[PDB]
Design an enzyme around this catalytic site. Structure first.
Site, PDB file in Angstrom:
ATOM      1  N   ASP A 179      38.318  32.153  46.013  1.00 12.12           N
ATOM      2  CA  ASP A 179      39.181  32.351  44.807  1.00 12.12           C
ATOM      3  C   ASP A 179      38.917  33.692  44.109  1.00 12.12           C
ATOM      4  O   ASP A 179      37.985  33.841  43.321  1.00 12.12           O
ATOM      5  CB  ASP A 179      39.005  31.175  43.839  1.00 12.12           C
ATOM      6  CG  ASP A 179      39.953  31.262  42.599  1.00 12.12           C
ATOM      7  OD1 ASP A 179      40.766  32.200  42.530  1.00 12.12           O
ATOM      8  OD2 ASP A 179      39.908  30.388  41.673  1.00 12.12           O
ATOM      9  N   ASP A 209      45.226  37.122  42.309  1.00 10.17           N
ATOM     10  CA  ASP A 209      44.576  35.772  42.231  1.00 10.17           C
ATOM     11  C   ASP A 209      44.840  34.922  43.462  1.00 10.17           C
ATOM     12  O   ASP A 209      45.889  34.370  43.597  1.00 10.17           O
ATOM     13  CB  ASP A 209      44.988  35.013  40.966  1.00 10.17           C
ATOM     14  CG  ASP A 209      44.393  33.586  40.884  1.00 10.17           C
ATOM     15  OD1 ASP A 209      45.006  32.671  40.254  1.00 10.17           O
ATOM     16  OD2 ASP A 209      43.311  33.372  41.457  1.00 10.17           O
TER      17      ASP A 209
HETATM   18  C1  LIG Z   1      46.843  27.232  39.276  1.00 14.11           C
HETATM   19  C2  LIG Z   1      46.289  25.905  39.783  1.00 14.11           C
HETATM   20  C3  LIG Z   1      46.671  25.850  41.251  1.00 14.11           C
HETATM   21  C4  LIG Z   1      46.945  24.646  39.174  1.00 14.11           C
HETATM   22  C5  LIG Z   1      44.803  25.879  39.463  1.00 14.11           C
HETATM   23  C6  LIG Z   1      44.383  25.086  38.402  1.00 14.11           C
HETATM   24  C7  LIG Z   1      43.020  24.994  38.069  1.00 14.11           C
HETATM   25  C8  LIG Z   1      42.077  25.738  38.792  1.00 14.11           C
HETATM   26  C9  LIG Z   1      42.486  26.576  39.857  1.00 14.11           C
HETATM   27  C10 LIG Z   1      41.508  27.402  40.675  1.00 14.11           C
HETATM   28  N1  LIG Z   1      41.884  28.843  40.497  1.00 14.11           N
HETATM   29  C11 LIG Z   1      41.739  29.410  39.163  1.00 14.11           C
HETATM   30  C12 LIG Z   1      42.374  30.757  39.027  1.00 14.11           C
HETATM   31  O1  LIG Z   1      43.703  30.461  39.390  1.00 14.11           O
HETATM   32  C13 LIG Z   1      42.429  31.247  37.567  1.00 14.11           C
HETATM   33  C14 LIG Z   1      43.206  32.565  37.383  1.00 14.11           C
HETATM   34  C15 LIG Z   1      42.971  33.028  35.945  1.00 14.11           C
HETATM   35  C16 LIG Z   1      42.259  34.210  35.694  1.00 14.11           C
HETATM   36  C17 LIG Z   1      41.971  34.602  34.384  1.00 14.11           C
HETATM   37  F1  LIG Z   1      41.304  35.707  34.132  1.00 14.11           F
HETATM   38  C18 LIG Z   1      42.382  33.843  33.298  1.00 14.11           C
HETATM   39  C19 LIG Z   1      43.084  32.664  33.551  1.00 14.11           C
HETATM   40  F2  LIG Z   1      43.488  31.974  32.498  1.00 14.11           F
HETATM   41  C20 LIG Z   1      43.388  32.252  34.863  1.00 14.11           C
HETATM   42  N2  LIG Z   1      41.050  31.481  37.120  1.00 14.11           N
HETATM   43  C21 LIG Z   1      40.430  30.703  36.226  1.00 14.11           C
HETATM   44  O2  LIG Z   1      40.974  29.736  35.705  1.00 14.11           O
HETATM   45  C22 LIG Z   1      39.000  31.022  35.836  1.00 14.11           C
HETATM   46  C23 LIG Z   1      38.970  32.157  34.776  1.00 14.11           C
HETATM   47  C24 LIG Z   1      37.595  32.424  34.136  1.00 14.11           C
HETATM   48  O3  LIG Z   1      36.997  31.182  33.732  1.00 14.11           O
HETATM   49  C25 LIG Z   1      36.688  33.010  35.189  1.00 14.11           C
HETATM   50  O4  LIG Z   1      35.966  32.258  35.842  1.00 14.11           O
HETATM   51  O5  LIG Z   1      36.707  34.212  35.423  1.00 14.11           O
HETATM   52  C26 LIG Z   1      40.014  27.266  40.223  1.00 14.11           C
HETATM   53  C27 LIG Z   1      39.264  25.988  40.604  1.00 14.11           C
HETATM   54  C28 LIG Z   1      39.474  25.567  42.034  1.00 14.11           C
HETATM   55  C29 LIG Z   1      41.001  25.475  42.362  1.00 14.11           C
HETATM   56  C30 LIG Z   1      41.681  26.861  42.120  1.00 14.11           C
HETATM   57  C31 LIG Z   1      43.859  26.626  40.170  1.00 14.11           C
END
Ligand SMILES: CC(C)(C)c1cccc(C2(NC[C@@H](O)[C@H](Cc3cc(F)cc(F)c3)NC(=O)CC[C@@H](O)C(=O)O)CCCCC2)c1
Length: 374
Positions: free
Chosen positions: A222, A35
Site C-alpha cells: 500500500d 495510492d
Molecule cells: C479505500 C478503501 C478501499 C475503502 C480503503 C479503506 C480503508 C483502508 C484502506 C487501505 N488503504 C489506505 C489508503 O487508501 C489511504 C490513502 C490516504 C492517504 C492519506 F494521506 C490520507 C488519507 F485520508 C487517505 N491511506 C490511509 O488511510 C492511511 C493514511 C495515514 O494514516 C498514513 O498511514 O499515512 C489501508 C488498510 C488496508 C486496506 C487498504 C483502503
C-alpha cells in the site's frame, strides 16, 4: 522507459508521494497522491482550509456530470463528492490523454493535510474495491483501455536525498532505477495489490508463528499508508524481538506505539542495535520464495527538530500493510498484465555502514499455499 517520468514524484515524510496531473480543458494543474491502497480518483473541488487550489468544473468545457454522489472512508480520513468525467493527463508521464472518472470532493474530514502540497488522490488498485461499486472504472484501467500504454506501472519511492522524491513509471520498467534482479510475487487476487508472506525473520531469527498469522486477514502492498502495519499477534512478536535487540537503550512506552519521538545527537543514531527485518514472499515457481530485507533506516522514520525518529511499524486489524516505509529503497513493479509484483533494490537504496537492504533468492519454502487466509 522513460526518462520523462523519472523523478516525477514529490512528498513530505509521512504524507505520501504525489505526481502532477492536469484535469479539464483548458488544463487545470493539481498535485495527486499516488495510492496503491485504493481505487478512486478524487480531487479537491471546493475551498477547504488546507487546499492551495482546487478543481473548477465550470471552467472545463470537457466536464460531464454523472449525477451520482460517492464517498470513500479510509483508515481515518473520509471525503464525499460528486461523480463526473473529464480529460486527464500527466505532464511527466506518458504522452497521452484519457477521459477518466473523477470524484469531485465537496466535503471531507481528516483527509487533506495542513501544508500538504497535494489536492487529490489517484487510487491505483482494482475496480473491486472502488466506491460506490466495481462499475466505476479506475483511472489506470481507463488509461489502459483508451491508449496503448502497457498494463504495468512501477514505483520508486525514495527517503531523504527534510522533504522527498521518487518516480512513477507508467507503462513499463525503467532499468536505470534499480540494481540486481527483480523478484516477483503473485498477486493473489485483483482487488488490493494482495500478496502472501510465507516467512518472517528478525536479525536472522524466525518469528516461528503459523504463516497464516502473517496474512490475517490479507497482506497488501500500500503506497498510500506510511507504516509497515502488522496483525496484532505478529506486531507483538515483532516488537518483543525489536525491544530485546535494542535493550541497551531506554525507550518510552509511547515510542513503540508510534505516538512519540526518540532523539539522538546529530550523526550518533545507534543504527547497529536495531535489527533487520526479513519478509519472505511467495515466489513464481513451486516451493520457492524470496526475501526482502528492511533496515532500521526504513522503519525508524525521521521528523525535523538532534536527529529525531518515529517507530514506523504499527498495529493493524485489517492485515499486513506494506506501506511507504517498506517500499522506500525498493523499485516495486506492479505487473498487472502478469498478475505479479516485482521487487528490486532501488537505485536510491538506503545505506548503513555495515548492512544493506536486499531482495534475495531463491529460498525453498514448503506449503506456501497454506499461508493464505481463507
Ligand atoms: C479505500 C478503501 C478501499 C475503502 C480503503 C479503506 C480503508 C483502508 C484502506 C487501505 N488503504 C489506505 C489508503 O487508501 C489511504 C490513502 C490516504 C492517504 C492519506 F494521506 C490520507 C488519507 F485520508 C487517505 N491511506 C490511509 O488511510 C492511511 C493514511 C495515514 O494514516 C498514513 O498511514 O499515512 C489501508 C488498510 C488496508 C486496506 C487498504 C483502503
Amino acid at each position: 522507459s522513460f526518462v520523462e517520468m523519472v523523478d516525477n514524484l514529490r512528498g513530505k515524510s509521512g504524507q505520501g508521494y504525489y505526481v502532477e496531473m492536469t484535469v479539464g480543458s483548458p488544463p487545470q494543474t493539481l498535485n495527486i497522491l499516488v495510492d496503491t491502497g485504493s481505487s478512486n480518483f478524487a480531487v479537491g473541488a471546493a475551498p477547504h482550509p488546507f487546499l492551495h487550489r482546487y478543481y473548477q468544473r465550470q471552467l472545463s468545457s470537457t466536464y460531464r456530470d454523472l449525477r451520482k454522489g460517492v464517498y470513500v472512508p479510509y483508515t481515518q480520513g473520509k471525503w464525499e463528492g460528486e461523480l463526473g468525467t473529464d480529460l486527464v493527463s500527466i505532464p511527466h508521464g506518458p504522452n497521452v490523454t484519457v477521459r477518466a472518472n473523477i470524484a469531485a470532493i465537496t466535503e471531507s474530514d481528516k483527509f487533506f493535510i495542513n501544508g500538504s502540497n497535494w489536492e487529490g488522490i489517484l487510487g491505483l488498485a482494482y475496480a473491486e474495491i472502488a466506491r460506490p461499486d466495481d462499475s466505476l472504472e479506475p483511472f489506470f484501467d481507463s488509461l489502459v483501455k483508451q491508449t496503448h500504454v502497457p498494463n504495468l506501472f512501477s514505483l520508486q519511492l525514495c527517503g531523504a536525498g527534510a522533504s522527498v522524491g521518487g518516480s512513477m513509471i507508467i507503462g513499463g520498467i525503467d532499468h536505470s532505477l534499480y540494481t540486481g534482479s527483480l523478484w516477483y510475487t503473485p498477486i493473489r487476487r485483483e482487488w488490493y495489490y494482495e500478496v502472501i508472506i510465507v516467512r518472517v525473520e528478525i536479525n536472522g531469527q524466525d518469528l516461528k508463528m503459523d504463516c497464516k498469522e502473517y496474512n490475517y486477514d490479507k497482506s497488501i502492498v500500500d503506497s498510500g499508508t506510511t507504516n509497515l502495519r502488522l496483525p496484532k499477534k505478529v506486531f507483538e512478536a515483532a516488537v518483543k524481538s525489536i525491544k530485546a535487540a535494542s535493550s541497551t537503550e531506554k525507550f518510552p512506552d509511547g515510542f513503540w506505539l508510534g505516538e512519540q519521538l526518540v532523539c539522538w545527537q546529530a550523526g550518533t543514531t545507534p543504527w547497529n542495535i536495531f535489527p533487520v527485518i526479513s519478509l519472505y514472499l511467495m515466489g513464481e515457481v513451486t516451493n520457492q520464495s524470496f526475501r526482502i530485507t528492511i533496515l532500521p533506516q526504513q522503519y525508524l522514520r525521521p521528523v525535523e527538530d538532534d536527529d529525531c525518529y518515529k517507530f514506523a511499524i504499527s498495529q493493524s486489524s485489517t492485515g499486513t500493510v506494506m506501506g511507504a516505509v517498506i517500499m522506500e529503497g525498493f523499485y516495486v513493479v506492479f505487473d498487472r498484465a502478469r498478475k505479479r509484483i516485482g521487487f528490486a533494490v532501488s537505485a536510491c537504496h538506503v545505506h548503513d555502514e555495515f548492512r544493506t537492504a536486499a531482495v534475495e533468492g531463491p529460498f525453498v519454502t514448503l506449503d506456501m499455499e497454506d499461508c493464505g487466509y481463507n
